[PDB]
């Protein structure tokens, strides 16, 4: 019981950190609405 509890809480903490880091990775796309040169990164830009 303790092991399943601790592993699930570790996983949910990891996924919350995932979401927060994803938000941070979203932040630079403030330049995206500006209609500028592609950046050639993990995300797509025409």
């Amino acid at each position: 019981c303790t092991c399943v509890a601790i592993i699930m809480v570790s996983c949910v903490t990891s996924v919350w950190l995932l979401c927060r880091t994803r938000n941070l990775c979203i932040t630079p796309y403030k330049l995206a609405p500006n209609a500028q040169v592609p950046i050639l990164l993990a995300l797509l830009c025409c």
Binding site: T27, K30, L31, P33, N34, A35, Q36, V37
Partner: protein, 151 residues
């Protein structure tokens, strides 16, 4: 051009202005936006950026022309006369650029809004402002001189 004051308590507290490509509202201040067409638009604010997402139907889309690099020192038509500087914000007259008129775009004489003011109340016997524009290659970056408060 559609530059609109923001309605708070039935008086002007801000000044929303639509730009080329995307519709813009300075989200630093609050108050119900006067325009009814904008009254039903979701808000997209970043951690430091106070800009509204562009959700106007594309009939009136791109009301303005955005601004490219290569800042000249020349005249930029401002709401209170032209402005002439290149290193940073123009040495606006004393008394002008105070408070309460947040969200005012500075435009090129060619109709290209060079930057958007986001403060910069006083800078001495002259006054520059804290604004945001393209950095060098078209990057929406804000510059804030020390002693900058929303104007």
């Amino acid at each position: 051009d559609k530059t609109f004051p923001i309605m708070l308590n039935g008086q002007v507290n801000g000044y929303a202005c639509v730009v080329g490509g995307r519709v813009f509202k300075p989200l630093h201040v609050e108050g119900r936006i006067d325009n009814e067409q904008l009254a039903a638009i979701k808000l997209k604010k970043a951690s430091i950026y106070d800009l509204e997402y562009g959700d106007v139907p594309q009939c009136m889309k791109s009301d303005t022309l955005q601004y490219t690099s290569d800042k000249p020192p020349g005249f930029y038509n401002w709401h209170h006369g032209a402005v002439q500087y290149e290193n940073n914000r123009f040495t606006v007259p004393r008394g002008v650029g105070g408070k309460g008129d947040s969200g005012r775009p500075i435009l090129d004489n060619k109709g290209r809004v060079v930057a958007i003011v986001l403060g910069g109340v006083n800078e001495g016997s002259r006054t520059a402002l804290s604004v945001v524009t393209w950095n060098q290659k078209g990057v929406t970056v804000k510059d804030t001189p020390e002693g900058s408060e929303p104007w």
